[PDB]
Write an enzyme that holds these catalytic residues in place. Sequence first.
Site, PDB file in Angstrom:
ATOM      1  N   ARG A  89      45.000   8.576 -12.625  1.00  0.00           N
ATOM      2  CA  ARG A  89      44.734   7.544 -13.789  1.00  0.00           C
ATOM      3  C   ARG A  89      46.178   7.454 -14.629  1.00  0.00           C
ATOM      4  O   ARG A  89      46.729   6.323 -14.692  1.00  0.00           O
ATOM      5  CB  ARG A  89      43.634   7.716 -14.599  1.00  0.00           C
ATOM      6  N   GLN A 172      32.308  -1.577 -29.520  1.00  0.00           N
ATOM      7  CA  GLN A 172      33.058  -2.392 -30.629  1.00  0.00           C
ATOM      8  C   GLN A 172      33.634  -1.548 -31.589  1.00  0.00           C
ATOM      9  O   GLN A 172      34.669  -1.730 -31.827  1.00  0.00           O
ATOM     10  CB  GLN A 172      32.068  -3.374 -31.164  1.00  0.00           C
ATOM     11  N   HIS A 176      37.940  -1.059 -31.997  1.00  0.00           N
ATOM     12  CA  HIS A 176      38.360  -1.753 -33.191  1.00  0.00           C
ATOM     13  C   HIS A 176      39.262  -0.712 -33.944  1.00  0.00           C
ATOM     14  O   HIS A 176      39.688  -1.266 -35.176  1.00  0.00           O
ATOM     15  CB  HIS A 176      37.389  -2.521 -33.858  1.00  0.00           C
ATOM     16  N   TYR A 324      28.669   7.541 -12.431  1.00  0.00           N
ATOM     17  CA  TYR A 324      28.941   8.917 -11.630  1.00  0.00           C
ATOM     18  C   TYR A 324      27.898   9.629 -11.643  1.00  0.00           C
ATOM     19  O   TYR A 324      27.224   9.840 -12.592  1.00  0.00           O
ATOM     20  CB  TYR A 324      30.339   9.266 -11.855  1.00  0.00           C
ATOM     21  N   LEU A 353      41.370  -6.922 -21.839  1.00  0.00           N
ATOM     22  CA  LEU A 353      40.241  -6.467 -20.775  1.00  0.00           C
ATOM     23  C   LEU A 353      39.028  -5.995 -21.598  1.00  0.00           C
ATOM     24  O   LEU A 353      38.044  -5.747 -21.091  1.00  0.00           O
ATOM     25  CB  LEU A 353      40.805  -5.603 -19.831  1.00  0.00           C
ATOM     26  N   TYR A 354      39.286  -5.561 -23.096  1.00  0.00           N
ATOM     27  CA  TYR A 354      38.191  -5.010 -23.539  1.00  0.00           C
ATOM     28  C   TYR A 354      37.459  -5.919 -24.365  1.00  0.00           C
ATOM     29  O   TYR A 354      36.386  -5.519 -24.992  1.00  0.00           O
ATOM     30  CB  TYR A 354      38.666  -3.838 -24.472  1.00  0.00           C
ATOM     31  N   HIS A 357      32.410  -9.274 -24.514  1.00  0.00           N
ATOM     32  CA  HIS A 357      31.521 -10.305 -25.252  1.00  0.00           C
ATOM     33  C   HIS A 357      30.273 -10.492 -24.383  1.00  0.00           C
ATOM     34  O   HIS A 357      29.208 -10.500 -24.922  1.00  0.00           O
ATOM     35  CB  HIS A 357      32.098 -11.267 -25.865  1.00  0.00           C
ATOM     36  N   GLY A 495      41.401  -0.735 -16.597  1.00  0.00           N
ATOM     37  CA  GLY A 495      41.010   0.037 -17.788  1.00  0.00           C
ATOM     38  C   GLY A 495      41.057   1.552 -18.112  1.00  0.00           C
ATOM     39  O   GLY A 495      41.491   1.692 -18.880  1.00  0.00           O
ATOM     40  N   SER A 499      42.416   3.812 -20.965  1.00  0.00           N
ATOM     41  CA  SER A 499      41.490   4.451 -21.682  1.00  0.00           C
ATOM     42  C   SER A 499      41.848   5.783 -21.826  1.00  0.00           C
ATOM     43  O   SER A 499      41.762   6.483 -22.791  1.00  0.00           O
ATOM     44  CB  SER A 499      39.998   4.412 -21.081  1.00  0.00           C
TER      45      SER A 499
HETATM   46  C1  HEM Z   1      28.082  -9.875 -32.271  1.00  0.00           C
HETATM   47  C2  HEM Z   1      29.339  -9.224 -32.763  1.00  0.00           C
HETATM   48  C3  HEM Z   1      30.717  -9.709 -32.289  1.00  0.00           C
HETATM   49  C4  HEM Z   1      31.016 -10.883 -33.120  1.00  0.00           C
HETATM   50  C5  HEM Z   1      30.578 -11.623 -33.918  1.00  0.00           C
HETATM   51  C6  HEM Z   1      32.697 -10.783 -32.250  1.00  0.00           C
HETATM   52  C7  HEM Z   1      33.505 -11.788 -32.549  1.00  0.00           C
HETATM   53  C8  HEM Z   1      34.853 -11.535 -32.430  1.00  0.00           C
HETATM   54  C9  HEM Z   1      35.784 -12.509 -33.096  1.00  0.00           C
HETATM   55  C10 HEM Z   1      35.727 -13.816 -33.933  1.00  0.00           C
HETATM   56  C11 HEM Z   1      37.196 -12.006 -32.548  1.00  0.00           C
HETATM   57  C12 HEM Z   1      38.598 -12.535 -33.183  1.00  0.00           C
HETATM   58  C13 HEM Z   1      39.790 -11.847 -32.463  1.00  0.00           C
HETATM   59  C14 HEM Z   1      40.409 -12.665 -31.554  1.00  0.00           C
HETATM   60  O1  HEM Z   1      40.597 -13.878 -31.682  1.00  0.00           O
HETATM   61  O2  HEM Z   1      41.035 -11.977 -30.460  1.00  0.00           O
HETATM   62  C15 HEM Z   1      36.616 -10.787 -31.816  1.00  0.00           C
HETATM   63  C16 HEM Z   1      37.709  -9.973 -31.344  1.00  0.00           C
HETATM   64  C17 HEM Z   1      37.705  -9.024 -30.354  1.00  0.00           C
HETATM   65  N1  HEM Z   1      36.363  -8.469 -29.864  1.00  0.00           N
HETATM   66 FE1  HEM Z   1      34.589  -9.219 -30.581  1.00  0.00          FE
HETATM   67  N2  HEM Z   1      32.672  -9.626 -31.494  1.00  0.00           N
HETATM   68  C18 HEM Z   1      31.652  -9.007 -31.229  1.00  0.00           C
HETATM   69  C19 HEM Z   1      31.291  -8.015 -30.205  1.00  0.00           C
HETATM   70  C20 HEM Z   1      32.330  -7.203 -29.936  1.00  0.00           C
HETATM   71  C21 HEM Z   1      31.904  -6.572 -28.898  1.00  0.00           C
HETATM   72  C22 HEM Z   1      30.562  -5.899 -28.613  1.00  0.00           C
HETATM   73  C23 HEM Z   1      33.111  -5.918 -28.236  1.00  0.00           C
HETATM   74  C24 HEM Z   1      33.137  -4.897 -27.135  1.00  0.00           C
HETATM   75  C25 HEM Z   1      34.178  -3.915 -27.065  1.00  0.00           C
HETATM   76  C26 HEM Z   1      34.133  -6.855 -28.684  1.00  0.00           C
HETATM   77  C27 HEM Z   1      35.513  -6.779 -28.419  1.00  0.00           C
HETATM   78  C28 HEM Z   1      36.477  -7.420 -28.959  1.00  0.00           C
HETATM   79  C29 HEM Z   1      37.904  -7.179 -28.997  1.00  0.00           C
HETATM   80  C30 HEM Z   1      38.709  -5.855 -28.029  1.00  0.00           C
HETATM   81  C31 HEM Z   1      38.520  -8.231 -29.742  1.00  0.00           C
HETATM   82  C32 HEM Z   1      40.197  -8.193 -30.030  1.00  0.00           C
HETATM   83  C33 HEM Z   1      40.521  -8.358 -31.463  1.00  0.00           C
HETATM   84  C34 HEM Z   1      41.781  -7.512 -32.035  1.00  0.00           C
HETATM   85  O3  HEM Z   1      42.596  -7.251 -31.293  1.00  0.00           O
HETATM   86  O4  HEM Z   1      41.845  -7.425 -33.092  1.00  0.00           O
HETATM   87  N3  HEM Z   1      33.504  -7.698 -29.842  1.00  0.00           N
HETATM   88  N4  HEM Z   1      35.587 -10.787 -31.675  1.00  0.00           N
HETATM   89  C1  LIG Z   2      38.729   7.464 -15.944  1.00  0.00           C
HETATM   90  S1  LIG Z   2      37.347   6.912 -15.190  1.00  0.00           S
HETATM   91  O1  LIG Z   2      36.338   8.016 -15.264  1.00  0.00           O
HETATM   92  O2  LIG Z   2      37.770   6.365 -13.857  1.00  0.00           O
HETATM   93  N1  LIG Z   2      36.953   5.708 -16.227  1.00  0.00           N
HETATM   94  C2  LIG Z   2      35.913   4.860 -15.614  1.00  0.00           C
HETATM   95  C3  LIG Z   2      35.533   4.867 -14.201  1.00  0.00           C
HETATM   96  C4  LIG Z   2      34.614   4.132 -13.819  1.00  0.00           C
HETATM   97  C5  LIG Z   2      34.114   3.171 -14.693  1.00  0.00           C
HETATM   98  N2  LIG Z   2      32.964   2.266 -14.302  1.00  0.00           N
HETATM   99  O3  LIG Z   2      32.391   1.255 -15.144  1.00  0.00           O
HETATM  100  O4  LIG Z   2      32.943   2.086 -12.836  1.00  0.00           O
HETATM  101  C6  LIG Z   2      34.386   3.116 -15.927  1.00  0.00           C
HETATM  102  C7  LIG Z   2      35.548   3.836 -16.459  1.00  0.00           C
HETATM  103  O5  LIG Z   2      35.946   3.668 -17.781  1.00  0.00           O
HETATM  104  C8  LIG Z   2      36.939   2.802 -18.307  1.00  0.00           C
HETATM  105  C9  LIG Z   2      36.555   3.002 -19.800  1.00  0.00           C
HETATM  106  C10 LIG Z   2      37.156   1.770 -20.500  1.00  0.00           C
HETATM  107  C11 LIG Z   2      36.733   0.399 -19.968  1.00  0.00           C
HETATM  108  C12 LIG Z   2      37.125   0.417 -18.267  1.00  0.00           C
HETATM  109  C13 LIG Z   2      36.750   1.406 -17.670  1.00  0.00           C
END
Ligand code: HEM
Ligand SMILES: CS(=O)(=O)Nc1ccc([N+](=O)[O-])cc1OC1CCCCC1
Lengths: 551, 551
Positions: A89, A172, A176, A324, A353-354, A357, A495, A499
């Site tokens: 990886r 989340q 974050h 796994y 990719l993260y 939602h 991913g 990661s």
């Molecule tokens: C219900 C709760 C949640 C709300 C209300 C919500 C809403 C939002 C909003 C409004 C943004 C604005 C940022 C942008 O425009 O890119 C955002 C960003 C983002 N959200 Fe969510 N989201 C929620 C849950 C989640 C979950 C469960 C994940 C899973 C990992 C996630 C992952 C992300 C990521 C990675 C960003 C990028 C923002 C940054 O780079 O600061 N969110 N979300």
């Molecule tokens: C090094 S790893 O073990 O290969 N990571 C990994 C392997 C397999 C899955 N998967 O859902 O089949 C998720 C994984 O984690 C990453 C964690 C961040 C999000 C993307 C997948």
Amino acid sequence: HHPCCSNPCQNRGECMSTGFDQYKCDCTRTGFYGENCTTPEFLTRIKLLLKPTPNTVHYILTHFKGVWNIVNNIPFLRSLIMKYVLTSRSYLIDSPPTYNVHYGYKSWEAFSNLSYYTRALPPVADDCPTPMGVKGNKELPDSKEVLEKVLLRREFIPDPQGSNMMFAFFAQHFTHQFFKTDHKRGPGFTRGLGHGVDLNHIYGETLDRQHKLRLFKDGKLKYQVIGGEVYPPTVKDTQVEMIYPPHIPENLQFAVGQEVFGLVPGLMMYATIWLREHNRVCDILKQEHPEWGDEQLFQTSRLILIGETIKIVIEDYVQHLSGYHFKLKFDPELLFNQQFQYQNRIASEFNTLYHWHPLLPDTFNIEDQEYSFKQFLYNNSILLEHGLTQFVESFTRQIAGRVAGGRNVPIAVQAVAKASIDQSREMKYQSLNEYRKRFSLKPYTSFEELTGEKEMAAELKALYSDIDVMELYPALLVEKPRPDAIFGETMVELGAPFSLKGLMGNPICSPQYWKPSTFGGEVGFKIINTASIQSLICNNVKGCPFTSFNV
Amino acid sequence: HHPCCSNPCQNRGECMSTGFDQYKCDCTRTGFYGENCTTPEFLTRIKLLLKPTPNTVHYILTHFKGVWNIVNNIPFLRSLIMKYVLTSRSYLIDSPPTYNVHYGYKSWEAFSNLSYYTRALPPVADDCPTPMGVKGNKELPDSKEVLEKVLLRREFIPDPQGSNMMFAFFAQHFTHQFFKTDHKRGPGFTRGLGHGVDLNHIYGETLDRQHKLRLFKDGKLKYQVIGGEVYPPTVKDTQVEMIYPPHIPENLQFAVGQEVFGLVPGLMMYATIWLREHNRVCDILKQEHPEWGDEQLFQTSRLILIGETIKIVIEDYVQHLSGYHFKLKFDPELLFNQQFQYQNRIASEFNTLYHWHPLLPDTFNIEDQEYSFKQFLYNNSILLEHGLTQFVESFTRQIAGRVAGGRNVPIAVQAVAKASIDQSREMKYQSLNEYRKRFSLKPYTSFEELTGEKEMAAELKALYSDIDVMELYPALLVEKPRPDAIFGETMVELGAPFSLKGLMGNPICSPQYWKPSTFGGEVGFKIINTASIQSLICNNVKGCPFTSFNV
Ligand code: HEM
Ligand SMILES: CS(=O)(=O)Nc1ccc([N+](=O)[O-])cc1OC1CCCCC1
Ligand code: HEM
Ligand SMILES: *[C@@H]1O[C@H](CO)[C@@H](O[C@@H]2O[C@H](CO)[C@@H](O[C@@H]3O[C@H](CO)[C@@H](O)[C@H](O)[C@@H]3O)[C@H](O)[C@H]2NC(C)=O)[C@H](O)[C@H]1NC(C)=O
Ligand SMILES: *[C@@H]1O[C@H](CO)[C@@H](O[C@@H]2O[C@H](CO)[C@@H](O)[C@H](O)[C@H]2NC(C)=O)[C@H](O)[C@H]1NC(C)=O
Ligand SMILES: *[C@@H]1O[C@H](CO)[C@@H](O[C@H]2O[C@H](CO)[C@@H](O)[C@H](O)[C@H]2NC(C)=O)[C@H](O)[C@H]1NC(C)=O
Ligand SMILES: *[C@@H]1O[C@H](CO)[C@@H](O[C@H]2O[C@H](CO)[C@@H](O)[C@H](O)[C@H]2NC(C)=O)[C@H](O)[C@H]1NC(C)=O
Ligand SMILES: CS(=O)(=O)Nc1ccc([N+](=O)[O-])cc1OC1CCCCC1
Ligand SMILES: CCCCCCCCO[C@@H]1O[C@H](CO)[C@@H](O)[C@H](O)[C@H]1O
Ligand SMILES: *[C@@H]1O[C@H](CO)[C@@H](O)[C@H](O)[C@H]1NC(C)=O
Ligand SMILES: *[C@@H]1O[C@H](CO)[C@@H](O)[C@H](O)[C@H]1NC(C)=O
């Protein structure tokens, strides 16, 4: 326009323009040669024939329970497998980092300026004939149309792996700390200059914020007691800035390390758990070290919590995702005989990719209430009415949505999914197939091949024309998922590298750090090395409820 | 007081207090065990028996001229020797870094705050009975007395290696990109957040400064033409802040990357050479790349100049210092099959040991003028009155002072030497012998053994009492030097690790960067790989005068 627009160079070779209309590939250490790095060296061809495909390796790891139970229990053998997972990886990531939104060539600006997210692939040049390079139409399909036809959710689709809300909010909360996009500046920028697991979402990014949240007694973070229960302190009390809308009662404006965590009770739950965890560890350490002052107690606990976080992420969180039967191991020692860079830089594509939602349900089911998004967002009083214990119990029971497979993004967050597409576009992201090649995967040859399905593929074809101009974000959320899995292949294969490097690339994993003395002795080192999602909840939540990342 | 004050743990094991009056050593991976990490594992004892002493290895490398000529000409064999030099030095440095002036234990603050210089050894705790730990008197000798009795110069002592002024000013100019102490904050802090060879002394530390010095045409830096010759622009023209005293004519207030380089004409000479060099490289690149814009030309030239600098430092500068008959090589490729961190952090002790003021002569001899320090400092008109060519010619001829061996710090800079002692003390530096142990060297058992001489040793004994409380800085400047050499053993054996890590630890030496494409193709890569102190002067100074680092 730019000679390198077609992305002519294959197999991780570097494209450099040589005249106004000519280009040269640099095939250094790619294991390929010739005009476009397409002809393999001899030993390369042997290594490629042998090396198995990712869907094959996945199957192996998710089948043959019997065999794995043998492996899981021979330490030498488990260590060896984990070592392979970590290294294979790892060497897919540029480290020290290279490109960013403004630099498609390597430069000191791109390297040294920590304000940018780094980039896995360079941006498409500002002057190519088409958005994706040379292929496809002058404009990409309208983003709302892409969203509506194939991303938005009709009936809710449950995750077949059974990920719960404890998982979703953990994801989340965790991500974050290092996805903190600096919107003043633009999508390619970040406020998370730690570039990794530094727990700045607990402790604060700057020292001014940290000192405002610290108690300065026994290493502890400030807190308040409400109904006998430990909660974070207030904005008023600490002077720590937080994003709350005006209508919120001042005593429900909790101040935590990350300024956005007031937005969502699910986040504020973890904020509280982790605050409790910090202070618990200060307590343990004050006992083992009556001689230590406040500063060392605080500092040491933070290092313990970093370790705990990494451990829980690998052995529970990633474990759950993987599906796994093999049992992943967090052991820095596995890298000590390896070439590995103990540094990280958060890549924009990793952030993209993260955006999981699709995990979010239509309503939030705590106890016997069902809360709409409008009800849930901002309502910290929900967390008090029910309390942490009921939160943990309910969130462990409620199932999350499937991410891959298409059409599962909650209508309530449609603006968020749109922005992911629009920002992909502002940041001049390369195409899905370019990313697949970049991470050693056969490019999709058709939309039916991408989705595994006929209906959405038909819709996408009439929107994009060419599979080769399919965008990365929408692709992730519509991809045929692995059988009974939460993600498709691209999601994992991009991913996982980001990661693991984000986790293992931490300084505490380095030989000079990975010693019991760093963590205040056998006791601290032991906290880290036996941490789990369960122990975290059990030690810090009244009643010690059972939890896991799946229903 | 702190249990670890005696520095009880040996062989790089880590001391951690365990109660108010007890301690525990952490012997992890030291190759030693037992209460104080003093008892060797079996394989350790074999490896120690075999491993030759540094004075031995030095002798080998400085004799047998015949044998080395054979070695110097078999590429495989030279590559193997250089590879040993690089790795053995390297693994003496904590990377990722550990301690700083405020943190004697590992911590996230210490790691992540780039404002601190890092620390090779932790500071002596704020509450130990004696300044050096437990040994010696309640106070250290008066720093003014240490200076006068054994540091200040009577009869100027010429460097037996024949280092000239071209060498001295190169040393000063080079090191001053990463020794930029932040005096507002304190001696443990730095303004050089690049932490290594980023050429910020040419391009500026912040982007504002860089943009203020850039022309924005063909990648070039702004400049002016005076008497047909290229010089830096002015403070007035650029708005770039510089340290000049009020009495200076506005047209002799040159603005370069590093704000202190006006102070000394020797520095302004290099500033001008390197500005000329940048612009030369933009010219070459513009020709190879008519399609490139200003931004890429600038950015790429910078990378080339970083490479040039590293090359010149290894093959000329360090070469000259070494006295070796073996010919050092700058080849990033030698580290590709090795465990090596492509990161650096400037250590405070590295800064301390580089205070090579004994190099400076009593007067500066340019053409047939002899200038006192008062005359020399600030006089940028000297550099115009004579011109760069006469500067290079005269500086190449004028011999520098010997650093080690005692009593050679110019009276003109006495305040500087004093401050190096006083700041060693404020930053709570450990003793000479602790540093010797830290870098694998027998502690000095007596002053006579340190100096190799009777007169100064006597003076030191009556100042310090115990060899074990001898301070690091004064020791460096009084140490018995290697035979006919500029430095003593400690100087090299501490310095070399920091130096090589500073150079090799650069991102441009990493496999993903070290490709011709990074430097705009075969031409750019070739500039780097054939750079020398001669070619630098020859290409940029009218008349192409001959130069080297020795008279
Ligand atoms: C219900 C709760 C949640 C709300 C209300 C919500 C809403 C939002 C909003 C409004 C943004 C604005 C940022 C942008 O425009 O890119 C955002 C960003 C983002 N959200 Fe969510 N989201 C929620 C849950 C989640 C979950 C469960 C994940 C899973 C990992 C996630 C992952 C992300 C990521 C990675 C960003 C990028 C923002 C940054 O780079 O600061 N969110 N979300
Ligand atoms: C090094 S790893 O073990 O290969 N990571 C990994 C392997 C397999 C899955 N998967 O859902 O089949 C998720 C994984 O984690 C990453 C964690 C961040 C999000 C993307 C997948
Ligand atoms: C032109 C003659 C020189 C003068 C007038 C001069 C003067 C000074 C002064 C005033 C300081 C600041 C002392 C303090 O920390 O308060 C200093 C620091 C220093 N000097 Fe010199 N110096 C000269 C030449 C050199 C040379 C030839 C070297 C060779 C390496 C050198 C190496 C250093 C270093 C490494 C520092 C530390 C600066 C920092 O921490 O930012 N100097 N010098
Ligand atoms: C790098 O670590 C350094 C050294 O500890 C940090 O500098 C310090 O920053 C603080 C707080 O931001 C300075 O200010 C002091 O705190 C209060 C806050 O209420 C402020 O009002 C006062 O001005 C007060 O003096 C502190 O003095 C300062 N230390 C210095 C200059 O030596 C620096 O912030 C760290 N960098 C990062 C990115 O954390
Ligand atoms: C990192 O890069 C950013 C963006 O290029 C730099 O911010 C720019 O700074 C200049 C001069 O101060 C301004 O004219 C631009 O408006 C800035 N861009 C912004 C604010 O988005 C930033 O200075 C760089 N980082 C460092 C540490 O120097
Ligand atoms: C390497 O890639 C280039 C650029 O994509 C290839 O370009 C050629 O292919 C086109 C598609 O059919 C031709 O019609 C073009 O005329 C041609 N483009 C050129 C020369 O710029 C090229 O064939 C590849 N070269 C090799 C040796 O594989
Ligand atoms: C490890 O080092 C410590 C101190 O450096 C040793 O402690 C003692 O050494 C002497 C011999 O036992 C005692 O007489 C002293 O009281 C005590 N020294 C100090 C400074 O407290 C200890 O013995 C060492 N361990 C071993 C195994 O030799
Ligand atoms: C990696 S090295 O080649 O072993 N460095 C080195 C070897 C020998 C000498 N010397 O004076 O004989 C100086 C050296 O360079 C450093 C330069 C900075 C100061 C300390 C010595
Ligand atoms: C609930 C979210 C859907 C809002 C309307 C989106 C615009 C039309 O989307 C349509 O949905 C139909 C049924 O799912 C499909 O048969 C079509 O392929 C699709 O184009
Ligand atoms: C906040 O949650 C409470 C439950 O404690 C609920 O009654 C109320 O409707 C919520 N507030 C908003 C604005 O939805
Ligand atoms: C500068 O050098 C000139 C050389 O003629 C000399 O008169 C004087 O000592 C110096 N003057 C100043 C003001 O720096």
